[PDB]
Design an enzyme around this catalytic site. Structure first.
Site, short mmCIF file in Angstrom:
data_model
loop_
_atom_site.label_atom_id
_atom_site.label_comp_id
_atom_site.label_asym_id
_atom_site.label_seq_id
_atom_site.Cartn_x
_atom_site.Cartn_y
_atom_site.Cartn_z
N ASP A 41 21.77 73.92 102.12
CA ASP A 41 21.21 73.50 100.85
C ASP A 41 21.94 74.21 99.72
OD1 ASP A 41 19.79 73.03 98.57
OD2 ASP A 41 17.81 73.40 99.47
N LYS A 70 21.61 69.65 90.72
CA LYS A 70 21.66 70.55 89.57
C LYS A 70 22.97 70.47 88.78
CE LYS A 70 18.42 74.11 91.19
NZ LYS A 70 17.50 73.86 90.05
N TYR A 111 4.33 74.49 87.95
CA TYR A 111 3.46 75.49 88.56
C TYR A 111 2.50 76.13 87.56
CZ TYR A 111 6.12 74.93 92.80
OH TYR A 111 6.70 74.41 93.94
N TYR A 171 13.94 78.73 99.76
CA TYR A 171 13.24 77.72 98.98
C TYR A 171 14.06 76.43 98.99
CZ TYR A 171 10.99 75.22 95.17
OH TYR A 171 10.36 74.26 94.40
C1 LIG Z 1 18.05 75.42 96.76
C2 LIG Z 1 17.17 74.47 96.23
N1 LIG Z 1 16.73 73.44 96.97
C3 LIG Z 1 15.84 72.49 96.41
C4 LIG Z 1 15.41 72.60 95.08
C5 LIG Z 1 14.52 71.69 94.53
O1 LIG Z 1 15.17 70.61 93.87
P1 LIG Z 1 14.34 69.83 92.72
O2 LIG Z 1 13.35 68.82 93.51
O3 LIG Z 1 15.24 69.07 91.82
O4 LIG Z 1 13.43 70.87 91.92
C6 LIG Z 1 15.85 73.68 94.32
C7 LIG Z 1 15.48 73.85 92.98
N2 LIG Z 1 14.16 74.44 92.73
C8 LIG Z 1 14.05 75.58 92.05
C9 LIG Z 1 15.17 76.23 91.57
C10 LIG Z 1 15.02 77.41 90.84
C11 LIG Z 1 13.75 77.92 90.56
C12 LIG Z 1 13.69 79.11 89.82
C13 LIG Z 1 12.42 79.27 88.96
C14 LIG Z 1 11.14 79.29 89.80
O5 LIG Z 1 10.01 79.45 88.94
N3 LIG Z 1 12.62 77.24 91.04
C15 LIG Z 1 12.77 76.05 91.78
O6 LIG Z 1 11.77 75.46 92.18
C16 LIG Z 1 16.74 74.58 94.91
O7 LIG Z 1 17.18 75.62 94.17
#
Ligand SMILES: Cc1ncc(COP(=O)(O)O)c(CNc2ccc(CCCO)[nH]c2=O)c1O
Ligand SMILES: Cc1ncc(COP(=O)(O)O)c(CNc2ccc(CCCO)[nH]c2=O)c1O
Lengths: 412, 417
Positions: free
Chosen positions: A233, A262, A19, A146
């Site tokens: 999720d 994660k 971003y 999110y």
């Molecule tokens: C619940 C959930 N579902 C889907 C994803 C995406 O999986 P990815 O495709 O592997 O990224 C995430 C992880 N994305 C993020 C986690 C944490 C921050 C904090 C900092 C923001 O600046 N920002 C993120 O975008 C997620 O937590």
């Protein structure tokens, strides 16, 4: 090879960051809960308070995970998952099906959280097509969520793309009136809805908000009664983070579909998984397509699966619940002093998650040096100063993390 | 640990495979227990047997499996730093790889966005294009145009530009093998009427992989570049399958000598060790996005720019560049041509084609898998036919004898059809 200065030069010229547009600190090493960063030409040790974004639950360079990876590397780095299967995938699938909420009996491996969410959407859509109800193709969620950055995942992110259904922000405290309103909204869209999709208990990227687990019980009930699939999720909340193995466990509910990632790999490699019930799998399999129409190149990568097996086994082979309880206590005690700060709106802790909510967006140019000066790597976002420490953090390290967080809040 | 029997039992009950069912698979997956060089060790009738990875595990294993140099690069990075978040931090592996990719890709591509898979890199490419035009004050340019026969992944946006056979995108006719100026004229005419609506053209240059292993004259790419420039539409090349020497050029675009505005790479990027992809764009695209109201490219996966994946990729790319790869590919192409020649006369064979280290036999009917699998396995080769195609894209390290083994297995499949 490159020196820290050459790295900065290449980075500024050629590398997109998350971003961002077209200044990062050079990281040169990671060991346990510590990163080695280069600051003003000097190496410094700082605590990885963010666990490198939820991932490094066992810290970096854990000998068990290192060796699991090197062991697999010696035998088989990767093979296609089309027409072939292998031990790491089988061992991991076996583990995941055993430790996730009851009923989740099938596993689809993918390479990232966003992709796993789209797979979950695919499952739900093909499910209802398999039931002869192709009109059920929309998704419903509550605000503040999110779920990733791919186009379908974006559609269910907090609006503030497919047009999805949004219920109001779920409150922290349980209010039966919220659940009643959610049901009433869902009721009028039921014939349109493939699934409800939510982050259980903790909403991460949308603002680190916590809600009462009882809301999840209500969702399961509403979805059951109106025949809408429930998708959790747990990409951020999985594997002990919130005080339970999976956040869904706080409510004792099982969704029809679940995403994990994660912490899955202990933060070594990219891997995610989407699980669904036998009923969903069979219905898709008995459907017109006769199969789930998804399959990435690197699906079920043996190296990623092998390190994940070891990460999960390492977690389950210790008293993780006590560990997390100790972390939660440490965070609570360490953050208490922030409550009285003038710019601090709220302080909240949920398992190994600690949040100071401030009255204004946090300026990174001020917070970052403040944190570094105290030997802690913090990455505030919007108005939040927060941490999700590795499970291996000692009490002294948690104290160091929380005191750094407090001083950041004080500067705001 | 699990025995092959226990693996199959777990697999059958709990594992989804690509585009497959649970409980309804006509053919059960085969247990793979090892991989080294160009060879896989698989369990057949309970017997471990070595077979050639004729598909390079889907274009990925260009240096074969367990190559000592790549294994070393990975273990070296593992000892120092497995991973750190790419938000506010940077590291040597990402920098070294970015520098390398910017230098060896078609001229003009000087910024690099790392992601975790090909499908995601395609979505990033799409975002770049859409944000580019929003930054120019033309938010109406939001659709994509491609030609039929293509494949770009299976996330929802990626799917929308895959050959139908979702966002409604613009599809031009299947591009022919031989160059026909008429095709390009018609393409231009179709694009022209959609120009004000189009953010980008997206295609696989020279070789369409998953969409049916079709080759097309590189001159078409020269035409696309010209059309896009004249009508103010960005050009996106998806080189996720064609990259890193596979078609006889470092990147397929090099056959046409053109540079896209945005480019996707993956697969062979990591030598097939770990999942990693990258989307590159020109300075103009990057600057226009950065100068727009959004002020940034709104994308950023958690695991972006993983040090281990980047480290092994650097080794893989360096290993390729440090050898006469062009001659190696030419030799492979010759071995494929020689080996597949005898299929040309088979009754059910409609086409035999080779492009660099890619070999294809196209039949006049669908290839029965229950006939093809044991036939190839008996011959020590792992083959994955689809539709009417029997094909291979072998590791660059395959010897003439291994290529003979592969092509002989393919011809036998073509014969049985
Ligand atoms: C619940 C959930 N579902 C889907 C994803 C995406 O999986 P990815 O495709 O592997 O990224 C995430 C992880 N994305 C993020 C986690 C944490 C921050 C904090 C900092 C923001 O600046 N920002 C993120 O975008 C997620 O937590
Ligand atoms: C040009 C191009 N652009 C984008 C993608 C998507 O990137 P991904 O998200 O990493 O998949 C692909 C993917 N190619 C394939 C995908 C899947 C299988 C089946 C493997 C069965 O074991 N075989 C493939 O060739 C691609 O070729």
């Amino acid at each position: 090879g490159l020196t820290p200065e050459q790295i900065i030069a290449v980075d500024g010229a050629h590398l997109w960051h998350p971003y961002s547009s077209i200044s990062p600190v050079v990281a040169v090493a990671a060991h346990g809960a510590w990163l080695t960063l280069i600051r003003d030409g000097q190496p410094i040790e700082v605590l990885d308070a963010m666990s490198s974004w939820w991932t490094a639950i066992h810290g970096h360079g854990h000998p068990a995970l290192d060796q699991a990876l090197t062991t697999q590397l010696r035998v088989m780095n990767h093979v296609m998952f089309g027409g072939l299967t292998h031990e790491p995938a089988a061992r991991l699938a076996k583990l995941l099906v055993d430790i996730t909420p009851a009923g989740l009996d099938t596993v689809f491996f993918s390479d990232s959280g966003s992709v796993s969410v789209e797979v979950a959407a695919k499952m739900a859509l093909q499910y209802w097509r398999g039931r002869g109800l192709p009109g059920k193709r929309r998704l419903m969620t509550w605000r503040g969520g999110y779920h990733g950055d791919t186009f379908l995942a974006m559609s269910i992110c907090d609006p503030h793309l497919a047009a999805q259904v949004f219920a109001p922000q779920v409150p922290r405290d349980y209010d039966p009136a919220y659940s009643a309103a959610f049901e009433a909204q869902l009721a009028q869209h039921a014939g349109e809805l493939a699934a409800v999709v939510v982050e259980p208990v903790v909403q991460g990227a949308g603002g680190m908000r916590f809600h009462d687990p009882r809301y999840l019980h209500d969702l399961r009930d509403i979805c059951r009664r109106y025949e809408v699939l429930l998708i959790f999720d747990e990409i951020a909340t999985g594997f002990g983070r919130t005080g339970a193995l999976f956040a869904a466990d706080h409510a004792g509910v099982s969704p029809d579909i679940m995403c994990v990632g994660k912490a899955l790999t202990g933060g070594y490699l990219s891997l995610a998984a989407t699980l669904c019930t036998a009923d969903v799998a069979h219905t898709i399999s008995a459907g017109a397509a006769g199969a789930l129409m998804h399959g990435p190149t690197f699906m079920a990568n043996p190296l990623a699966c092998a390190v994940s097996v070891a990460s999960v086994e390492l977690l389950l082979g210790q008293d993780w619940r006590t560990r997390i309880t100790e972390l939660a206590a440490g965070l609570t005690a360490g953050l208490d002093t922030a409550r009285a700060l003038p710019a601090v709106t709220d302080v909240r802790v949920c398992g190994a998650i600690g949040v100071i909510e401030c009255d204004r967006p946090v300026d990174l140019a001020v917070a970052t040096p403040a944190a570094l000066d105290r030997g802690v790597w913090l990455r505030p976002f919007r108005n939040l100063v927060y941490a999700m420490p590795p499970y291996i953090c000692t009490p002294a390290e948690i104290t160091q993390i929380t005191s750094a967080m407090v001083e950041v809040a004080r500067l705001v």
